[PDB]
Each structure stands twice: as C-alpha cells, then as structure tokens.
Amino acid sequence: TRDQNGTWEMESNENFEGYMKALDIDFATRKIAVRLTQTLVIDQDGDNFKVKTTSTFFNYDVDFTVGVEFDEYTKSLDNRHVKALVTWEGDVLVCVQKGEKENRGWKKWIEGDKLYLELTCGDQVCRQVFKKK
Numbered sequence: 001t002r003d004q005n006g007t008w009e010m011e012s013n014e015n016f017e018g019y020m021k022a023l024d025i026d027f028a029t030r031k032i033a034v035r036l037t038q039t040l041v042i043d044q045d046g047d048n049f050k051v052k053t054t055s056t057f058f059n060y061d062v063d064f065t066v067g068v069e070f071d072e073y074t075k076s077l078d079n080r081h082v083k084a085l086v087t088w089e090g091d092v093l094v095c096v097q098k099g100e101k102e103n104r105g106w107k108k109w110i111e112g113d114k115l116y117l118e119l120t121c122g123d124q125v126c127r128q129v130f131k132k133k
C-alpha cells in the first residue's frame with residue numbers, strides 16, 4: 001500500500017554504520033546512533049508528508065510534498081546541501097538527494113503490518129524495518 005501513515009517502531013537496523021560512514025557522519029556520533037531503536041511518525045495527507053524520527057538522543061523532522069523538489073541543508077547530519085525530490089514508483093516511495101554523494105536518498109514501502117526503509121549513500125545500503133505501534 002501507499003498509505004504510510006502511523007507511528008512505527010524499529011525492529012531491525014541493518015548496516016546503519018556503513019550508511020553513516022558513507023555520509024561521513026563523525027565516528028563519535030556513529031557510536032551513539034548505530035544501534036539506537038528508532039520511532040518514525042508519519043502523517044500523510046495526499047501528496048503532503050510530515051515525518052518525525054525520534055530516538056533517546058536524536059530527533060529529526062522533515063516535511064515534503066511528493067513531486068516537489070526542495071533544497072535541504074543537512075546540518076544536523078553530514079552538513080551538506082542537496083536537492084531532494086520524493087516520488088512514487090508503484091507503491092515504493094523514493095527520495096533522491098542530488099548533491100556531492102552518489103546514490104544518496106532512500107526508498108520506503110509498506111509490506112503488511114511493517115514499514116521498510118532503505119537508506120542509501122555511495123555503495124552503502126542500510127535496511128530498517130518498523131512495526132506499526
């Protein structure tokens with residue numbers, strides 16, 4: 001389904017370290033974040049998304065409209081400027097972050113009671129799986 005609405009609690013986090021290292025996230029920061037359990041809160045109304053990612057130490061917020069390019073400055077992460085665009089490929093939601101890093105972005109999809117997130121940067125792929133709360 002395309003309906004990604006809900007509160008989603010992480011059950012699996014594969015290769016978050018590699019993704020973070022490919023982004024050039026500082027070594028000391030990665031040590032904290034690498035095995036933190038995350039919660040994703042997604043509010044989806046038509047093409048409009050509000051997404052909040054929360055953990056014990058880190059909170060993130062991003063709002064976007066599907067099909068509308070937008071500049072991002074990822075200063076709380078790797079501190080870079082990218083041009084972000086989120087679109088649908090079938091029922092897979094695809095974000096491309098155009099900039100210095102190749103293959104940078106993510107794919108997100110629902111399969112059952114679970115939300116899957118694939119974060120990509122360079123040659124690295126992180127896969128996270130969440131269950132709806």
Ligand SMILES: *C/C=C(C)/C=C/C=C(C)/C=C/C1=C(C)CCCC1(C)C
Nearest residue numbers: 020033051053058059060062077108
């Ligand atoms: C729709 C799914 C989205 C927008 C996923 C967002 C995930 C993040 C913004 C994760 C950010 C972080 C890192 C990449 C490194 C560790 C610190 C975090 C959790 C803020």
